């Protein structure tokens, strides 16, 4: 079983996890129409996916110049990691969706709107999540079973998703991404605080697991933001999400490259979705 | 609303709480037969008690030379404190039961057996608790909504209840009571640890809020026991039961007397029954 650590450390997946696992989850290519026109995404279903069961769902965004296919391409191979981790019992089965911020009027920053209105209702009406319906009320009532993350520009997307979508999403994984508000780290922090206040949520209802590499240029802006967030009452700093809600993993020597960032996901994603989960688990 | 503090301090109820509250809960005198013959207890029902609702239940034991009527007599007046705290919103409504360790073969130490077999089934078949039935399975499945405490010899009773009844009871309030096992504080601690291990429970499924006065002779044996318990992995020391599960409140200058001990209860009882509660509360 999984056990929460209070300060989890960078730990890459074994080399063999980058290769195909014979217990492969199905990746389905989907096309949908929304406020930024006709676009595509991929949905990863866990091996043994049973549509009579309910699954947590994690949405994960690519970086600049990439697209909805990148994360599951040979350039990244995240599905192989997911497959092997799920078969070995390190990660509880979940749906992982890779959308895009390209197309139409869409930008990494404004994607949250298409996410709220088109992406969630499209995905979660077809696949089996904890959403009982895809009205605003049904999405909001299943928020504990929904997560959002992304790398670089997709990291930035994640931040704008948290500030605009706390009603719909409880778990956030910004990977090497800055957030732009005011002109100081404190102003960034305070914008996030004000979003949390408007939401009415308690400290046990939102969770942030950020990460980057110590040789990734994103560290320069992320670290002061994280420090300013630590000062806020809204966040209790620890990776033990049974006790707190905010952690920053820094991989020593890691650069701004999917080859490393895929391992952040391997490290952080097993920490998601246990709070108020419907299983009886000791973590 | 109530908010958890990480190190709650001794704070007596206002003087006016010792007087009758016009929103008085009903105290019902009950007689039952069990393994120690025919005996009595009192059941305190909260003001507005609705038998269509479910209530948490706290069992509370008297000291040496006292009886099932003592805690709700003029010598103690706990019901007035309960009444006023419940009317002012400081304590969520609950059933409080005062049994006795007198009669038959019963002793403060061996009461746990009569408690398991006769007291719980008698009380919880008549009054409205979270127990869906009073078989061993129905009691065990409602354990998160059951608590046990007591003063002096009743404190000792509480300890023997924890070591024998973790399957039935999640919250424990030993007040000025020692536990006897081995001849060192570590041996006491290790006996409690071994009981927790046999139960299969996690750290989020049992809670201990101990207390005494700094001028109460019980402090002499309680404090080394508590220290030895702190060292165990089984217990995370803090009164914030959303994060940990073990606290020791020491009232400075307080003596071995109900006049003080009733205030420990006022302080500690609002901390009980919130973990995995069926209400939507921010604490």
Residue numbers in the entry:
A (entry chain A), B (entry chain A): 803 to 1085
Sentences from the study reporting this entry:
The RoboDiff forms the core of the services offered on the ESRF beamline MASSIF-1 and, thus far, has been used to mount, characterize and collect diffraction data from over 20 000 samples since September 2014. In all three cases diffraction images were indexed and integrated using XDS and reduced using AIMLESS.
ARP/wARP was then run for automatic model building. Both models were completed manually using Coot interspersed with refinement with REFMAC5.
